[PDB]
Design a binder for these strands. Structure first.
Length: 1063
DNA sequence: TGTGTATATTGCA
RNA sequence: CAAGACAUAGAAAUAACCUGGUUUGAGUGUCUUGUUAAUAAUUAACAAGAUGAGUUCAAAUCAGGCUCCUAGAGAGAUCCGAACUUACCUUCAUGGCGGGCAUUGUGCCCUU
DNA sequence: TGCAATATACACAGGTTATTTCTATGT
């Protein structure tokens, strides 16, 4: 009949919608005004979820490496201690919960135990120093332990250098760099200023650029502009534009060895290599440097010891009564809290969370104040400012340690053991000894383009290409090149990220430098008639010799463009592809191919460009053609498109589950669009026909107008300029009080229908004004099942953990699931949804609303499953599940007041206000103006007689807001506020303007549906968390006069009240 | 942020 | 003078890494007096006084799922598991969710 | 002598490399 309109105000946390005819005056359906505010939560991005996924895979890989490393030492360790590998696995458990009841974690011999092992080696670095320096035959368990600790702390893999160097001081290798004097003679001042040259380049805190400028002032390309880390020009390497620029940070000389072949020759690597390894290993007492990182930590261990005796003497000499509170006692950020353990008065060790030195340093500064100034006090205060006082080896500050620095200790420890344990040098079928495998395991990490090495089910992101006959074979560092087709899988990694075709949907686009795609741009410009060019042909005819490309070298040429784009840089792939497939090209030909680099992709695919309409690429050639009429309905090429992809537009009207995937939409936008569809799908069907127009307002909107244009094609979607609606609120006096209620979202959607259809194209104003101030809009909240973490991410202390309330470490392990107060557990166990169960408590039939935990959601879907859960776990007598799913934030009507079932509070149910406050339109402007003063704007620069008006207007509002909480719907809440609002009335007058306007907004937090109901009415004398309402878990029929559950559809058109006291 | 949740305080008959 | 050469900055998705952190356990605490105990003096228990140490390691790190067993505080695999989707009712259908007035306080009328 | 209604405290995070989409600038 009469076509209607739909306006939308779509936002990341709420979607407002409105329905109107050609003359506003909202359409009426099911006896309701057809507008409302669909509210929900902002959708979480996948970045956090990806954080745990990669962390899980990293933990999985670290567990395999620990397993494989243990199998290398498995046979030799068994000869002395069979259970050593299993003793380490039994570490968390108390002596009564481990497989073998042995007290100590690692060593359980007669002479040697954990107490004796730490007397010889107080720290792991002390063990490693013995493992490296000493040539005595060590116990294989100690050798394994030293190697194992390096595996736990491998260091970063960012620095590309040659650990393989045996040993060479900076004085020695500089002499080699003096050689090759074919330069402008900068290589000799390498020896002259070597003392300043070595330390300045080694210094790890000097900025690399500032380090670069100062050194050349004494050495006066140059290679002195590359030590920072950047591309290096080959202008001076005995023969500019032939850069093949290598940056020492990005690529290894061995990797660039084929690149530099056929051309200050190679030793310039060593000086840069020296800087990376020895930057952080500089001795302070002397001028030299340590050899291995273990040697640098025993020295740091001894400085911390020397720092401790200074603090102990200072405290005992000056404040001996405060000595006991800082060292032999656990408090906030004292020394014991810093170390994380304490042992005094013969009591057991009190191991807790460790303190950060920032708060620990602050604790000494406040603690030295009561000591009069002296030499030691100034000296200790000096070190704290420098940050070198009482340092610990492990912590967030060890992000500098590279793998090559740790690889040096691995080789030295393994080499020192080969002279004593022959099992490390027994070769095998691959001619690899144990050392060749441990060293390979240590430094080998999967390259970023391989991804996960297995796809048990095709549900993950894995794309690795296993070679034929190598499936279901574990990948090792030595098996990596055989099992995994590294070139083929790296092709997929780039390919999967490539965009899809603009018109066709199943084929990836072609490179923008590909031959046929380079054409499509030029004939597009030919029709327009230059901003485009056809240059790949101009470029590729040099390689092939022939000036004009035939049809047998064009397919030759296009495979190179794809390879030079998919395999950009990383010449081990491009060169391998050419050499094996096409051995015809010579060395200069291959090197010239790497010379040009294109890595951009077009908007269209190869399959689309060669479609048999009656090839579209030739269609732009023979005729002049129109830019968009070629693929429009007026032509036969459009029909050819639909046959290639059987997918239909809009999918199905009633089925559009996840059509938003692949459109590069953030998770907040995807949820915000989807709930918009849940409304329109429910309005166009409740009404008979489809809306003539759709108005919307939130540049990614172009991706949004499109996918909705699929829905209801006959509609005329209109986008209204942002800020146009706010102009209507100004000139036509329609204030928007965002802090009052959520009705503005509906009005914003409603006004969207007004600015539109008038910007594009009586008493019209009166109808809009009357509608704009209506209380009609139906505000719904998206009910859902809570997703995310099952509980808190980290375990809490066993002292703070109690059974039943805290999720154990492992539920399937009876050791953890039964001793939550012994091993700790996960706090705040999140629940998915709620369900209603009727049980007999105190020999009386009552009902309670219990929750289904997120970790039990899948096995608790049926009523029989839920009843069994109540009987055994919840402990209910004769359970009878009446409702199986009460979602989170479900509407409840309790004693006439509407709430939201947000969560739970121990034995209670947390509720939030679901009722909208409605103040008269005159006080809407004052609240909007109150927020700005509380939001930062100052009342000091105000008229002396406009400020007494401020107090009185504020007084009237507080007096009015004291009435809605007294005699209105807002008087039926739990924990009422009206009695308390009058109680603090004398403190509302007796306060400044700013403070008495920061409580008005806090009061308004008690009648807002967007936030949890609570108020910071502490300025007027109440509490910072005031007004929280929380009913009991049990629905006693005598306590509540009524208790419903309003199940509303997303538009709210269909409601269903389920009396929780009956059904 | 903001909030779900355990935890704590406060009357109170 | 718009490309480009680049730089830098941010967002999104994915992959590969590091430092940790957290929890539990290990890293033997020792002396003095007093009280009360077992039994001339000791060994505990407890309380109050003191006192010396301290830097690390091991294992787990969403619950869990997956393969195989010949069912275990078992092996395997090293990847699935914190993002996105769901009102309610049914034969799970392009089904249903009665017909209408109000719209500042959660109502009213006609029907089943 | 609990006990219901109110009010309170608080939570894993800081870096790195690479790719592909997508902007922002000056340079």
């Amino acid at each position: 009949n009469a076509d209607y309109y739909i306006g939308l105000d779509m936002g990341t946390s709420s979607a407002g919608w409105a329905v109107s005819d050609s003359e506003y005056n909202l359409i009426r359906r099911k006896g309701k005004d057809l507008w409302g505010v669909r509210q929900f939560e902002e959708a979480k991005t996948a970045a956090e979820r990806r954080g745990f996924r990669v962390a899980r895979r990293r933990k999985q890989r670290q567990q395999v490496r620990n397993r494989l490393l243990s199998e290398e030492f498995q046979n030799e360790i068994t000869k002395i201690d069979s259970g050593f590998l299993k003793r380490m696995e039994d570490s968390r458990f108390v002596i009564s919960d481990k497989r073998v009841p042995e007290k100590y974690t690692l060593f359980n011999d007669s002479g040697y135990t954990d107490v004796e092992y730490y007397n010889q080696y107080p720290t792991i670095y002390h063990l490693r120093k013995a493992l490296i320096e000493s040539n005595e035959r060590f116990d294989i368990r100690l050798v394994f332990l030293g190697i194992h600790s390096l595996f736990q702390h491998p260091g970063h893999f960012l620095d590309k250098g040659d650990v393989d160097t045996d040993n060479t001081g900076p004085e020695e290798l500089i002499q080699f760099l003096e050689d090759c004097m074919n330069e402008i003679q900068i290589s000799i001042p390498l020896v002259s200023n070597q003392k300043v040259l070595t330390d300045i380049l080694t210094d790890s805190r000097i900025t690399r650029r500032d380090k670069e400028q100062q050194i050349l002032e004494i050495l006066q390309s140059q290679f002195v502009k590359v030590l920072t880390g950047q591309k290096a020009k080959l202008g001076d390497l005995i023969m500019e534009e032939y850069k093949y620029s290598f940056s020492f940070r990005e690529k290894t000389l061995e990797e660039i060895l084929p690149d530099i072949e056929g051309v200050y020759i190679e030793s310039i690597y060593s000086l840069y290599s020296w800087s990376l390894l020895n930057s952080y290993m500089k001795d302070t007492l002397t001028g030299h440097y340590y050899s291995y990182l273990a040697e640098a930590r025993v020295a740091a261990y001894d400085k911390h010891h020397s720092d401790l005796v200074k603090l102990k003497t200072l405290f005992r000499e000056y404040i001996p009564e405060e000595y006991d509170n800082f060292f032999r006692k656990m408090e906030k950020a004292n020394y014991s809290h810093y170390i994380g353990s304490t042992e005094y008065d013969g009591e057991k060790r009190c191991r807790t969370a460790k303190a950060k030195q920032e708060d620990f340093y602050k604790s000494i500064n406040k603690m030295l104040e009561k000591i009069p100034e002296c030499s030691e006090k100034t000296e200790i205060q000096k070190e704290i400012i420098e940050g070198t006082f009482l340092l610990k080896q492990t912590g967030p500050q060890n992000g500098f340690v590279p793998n090559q620095l740790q690889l040096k200790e691995l080789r030295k420890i393994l080499q020192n053991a080969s002279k004593h344990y022959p099992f490390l040098t027994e070769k095998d079928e691959r001619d690899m000894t144990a050392i060749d495998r441990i060293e390979a395991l240590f430094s080998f990490r999967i390259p970023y383009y391989i991804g996960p090495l297995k796809n048990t089910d095709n549900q993950g992101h894995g794309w690795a290409v296993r070679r034929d006959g190598h499936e279901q074979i574990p990948v090792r560092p030595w098996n990596f090149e055989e099992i995994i087709d590294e070139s083929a899988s790296a092709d997929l990694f780039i390919k999967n990220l490539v965009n899809s075709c603009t018109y066709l949907r199943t084929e990836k686009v072609l490179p923008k430098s590909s031959l046929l795609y380079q054409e499509f741009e030029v004939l597009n410009e030919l029709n327009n008639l230059f901003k485009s060019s056809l240059s790949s042909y101009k470029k590729f005819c040099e390689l092939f010799g022939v000036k004009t490309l035939n049809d047998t070298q064009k397919v030759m040429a296009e495979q190179i463009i794809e390879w030079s784009t998919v395999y950009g840089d990383s010449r081990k792939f491009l060169k391998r592809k050419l050499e094996d497939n096409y051995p015809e090209l010579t060395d200069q030909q291959i090197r010239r191919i790497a010379g040009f680099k294109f890595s951009e992709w077009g908007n269209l695919s190869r399959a689309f460009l060669e479609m048999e309409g009656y090839t579209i690429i030739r269609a732009l050639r023979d005729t002049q053609k129109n830019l968009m009429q070629l693929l429009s309905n007026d032509s036969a090429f459009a029909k050819k498109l639909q046959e290639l992809n059987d997918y239909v537009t809009r999918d199905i009207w009633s089925i559009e589950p996840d059509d938003l995937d692949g459109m590069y939409l953030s998770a907040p936008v995807r949820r915000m669009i989807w709930q918009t569809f849940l409304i329109l799908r429910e309005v166009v069907d409740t009404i008979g026909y489809s809306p003539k127009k759709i108005f919307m307002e939130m540049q990614g909107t172009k991706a949004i107008i499109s996918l909705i244009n699929q829905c209801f094609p006959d509609s005329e979607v209109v986008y209204v300029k942002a800020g146009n609606t706010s102009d209507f609120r100004q000139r036509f006096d329609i204030p928007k009080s965002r802090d009052l209620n959520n009705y503005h979202h509906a009005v914003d959607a409603y006004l969207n229908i007004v600015v539109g259809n008038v910007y594009d194209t009586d008493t019209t104003l009166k109808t809009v004004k009357k509608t704009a101030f209506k209380t009609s809009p139906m505000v719904t909240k998206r009910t859902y099942e809570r997703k995310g973490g099952l509980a808190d991410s980290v375990l809490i202390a066993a002292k703070k953990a109690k059974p039943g309330v805290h999720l154990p470490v492992k539920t399937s392990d009876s050791r953890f699931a039964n001793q939550v107060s012994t091993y700790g557990g996960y706090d705040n166990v999140k629940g998915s949804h709620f369900f209603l169960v009727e049980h007999q408590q105190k020999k009386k039939t009552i009902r309670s609303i219990e929750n289904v935990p997120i970790h039990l959601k899948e096995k608790l879907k049926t009523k029989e499953e839920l009843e069994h859960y109540c009987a055994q776990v919840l402990g209910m007598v004769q359970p009878d599940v009446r409702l199986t799913r009460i979602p989170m934030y479900s509407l409840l009507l309790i004693d006439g007041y509407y709430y939201y079932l947000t969560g739970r509070t121990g034995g209670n149910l947390s509720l939030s206000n679901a009722v909208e406050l409605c103040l008269p339109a005159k006080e809407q402007a004052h609240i909007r103006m109150i927020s700005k003063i509380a939001g930062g704007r100052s009342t000091d620069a105000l008229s002396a007689e406009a400020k007494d008006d401020f107090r009185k207007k504020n007084l009237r509002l507080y007096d009015e807001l004291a009435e809605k909480h007294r005699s209105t719907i807002f008087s039926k809440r739990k924990n009422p506020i009206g009695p308390k609002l009058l109680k603090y009335r004398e403190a509302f007058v007796k306060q400044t303007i700013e403070n008495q306007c920061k409580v008005i907004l806090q009061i308004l937090k008690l009648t807002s549906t967007n936030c949890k109901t609570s108020a910071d009415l502490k300025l007027i004398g109440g509490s910072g968390q005031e007004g929280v309402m929380s009913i009991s878990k049990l629905l006693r029929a005598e306590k509540y006069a009524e208790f419903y559950l309003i199940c509303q559809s997303p538009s709210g058109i269909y409601e269903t009240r389920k009396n929780l006291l009956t059904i």
